[PDB]
Write an enzyme that holds these catalytic residues in place. Structure first.
Site, PDB file in Angstrom:
ATOM      1  N   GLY A  33       0.891  -1.028  -0.058  1.00  0.00           N
ATOM      2  CA  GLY A  33       0.151   0.116   0.066  1.00  0.00           C
ATOM      3  C   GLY A  33       0.927   1.217   0.164  1.00  0.00           C
ATOM      4  N   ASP A  87      -3.548   7.277  13.935  1.00  0.00           N
ATOM      5  CA  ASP A  87      -4.274   6.486  12.997  1.00  0.00           C
ATOM      6  C   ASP A  87      -4.754   5.242  13.433  1.00  0.00           C
ATOM      7  OD1 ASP A  87      -5.432   6.021  10.244  1.00  0.00           O
ATOM      8  OD2 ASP A  87      -3.400   5.617   9.500  1.00  0.00           O
TER       9      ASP A  87
END
Ligand SMILES: CN(C)CC[C@@H](c1ccccc1)n1cc(NC(=O)c2n[nH]c3c2CCC(C)(C)C3)cn1
Length: 240
Positions: free
Chosen positions: A16, A124
């Site tokens: 990613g 996050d």
């Protein structure tokens, strides 16, 4: 510092960054994270490592070490057998009792209370950033725009604190109890900013009791001052 000759790269298991299943000294499984083309710098990786090498808790994915003589450098982590929590919730949906979902939230809360004690902000926290191990243990994944998980002071002003992680943890609880549903019906970041700014909050998942739902709502108080610390959430979740 891990010598490159101590690692064997077996197969890709994520990207990613890029993540490979590897073996460390040909015996034990590890997850090896490498920097993605040029998406991020080596110094960023180094900063993550300098933070994470000082930390150790059973509900935080462990960073074992850094391989400095790779190009680009790589980070060597605890291998988590069942992958990310978000996928696991979605894949096994309909098989979870409330008590099991609660246990997953407690696992994460324990990790986060350690981070809080250690003066580290995750920034996050989300189900996609938790991993599932043996015996269905959840661990928080690495640390060192996701509006759907962001407190209003974070999406408006980038004001991070343990209390903004608390807001995220409330959303994560919602994810867990909803078995991987996407918060806010996957509305746009602009729309979610507008939702949260006006006082909108996520509705109760079926599997969440009234009591669990009030803890979630406490995590989503507008001022961080009004949200519970992780130390307090841990006592609440453990008392259930
Ligand atoms: C069936 N499926 C849902 C899980 C498959 C599983 C797997 C992968 C290869 C060999 C055996 C098992 N798997 C296990 C992972 N684990 C990880 O990605 C992982 N384990 N530790 C870390 C990570 C990703 C993030 C990390 C920071 C590198 C730390 C990914 N896939």
């Amino acid at each position: 510092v891990i010598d490159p000759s101590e690692l064997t790269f077996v197969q890709e298991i994520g990207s990613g960054g890029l993540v490979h299943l590897g073996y460390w000294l040909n015996k034990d499984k590890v997850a090896i994270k490498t920097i993605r083309e040029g998406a991020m710098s080596e110094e960023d990786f180094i900063e993550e490592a300098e933070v994470m090498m000082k930390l150790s808790h059973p509900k935080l994915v462990q960073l074992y070490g850094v391989c400095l003589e790779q190009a680009p450098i790589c980070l060597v982590f605890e291998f988590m057998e069942h992958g990310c929590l978000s996928d696991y919730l979605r894949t096994q949906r309909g098989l979870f009792a409330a008590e099991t979902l609660l246990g997953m939230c407690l696992d994460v809360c324990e990790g986060m209370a350690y981070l809080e004690e250690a003066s580290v902000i995750h920034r996050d926290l989300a189900a996609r950033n938790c991993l599932v191990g043996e015996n269905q243990v959840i661990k928080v994944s690495d640390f060192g725009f996701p509006v759907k998980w962001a407190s209003p002071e974070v999406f408006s002003f980038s004001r991070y604190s343990s209390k903004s992680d608390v807001w995220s943890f409330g959303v994560l609880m919602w994810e867990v109890f909803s078995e991987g549903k996407i918060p806010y019906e996957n509305r746009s970041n602009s729309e979610v900013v507008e939702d949260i700014s006006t006082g909108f909050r996520l509705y109760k998942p079926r599997l969440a009791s009234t009591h669990v739902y009030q803890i979630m709502n406490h995590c989503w108080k507008e001022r961080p001052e009004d949200r519970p610390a992780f130390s307090r959430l841990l006592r609440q979740l453990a008392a259930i």
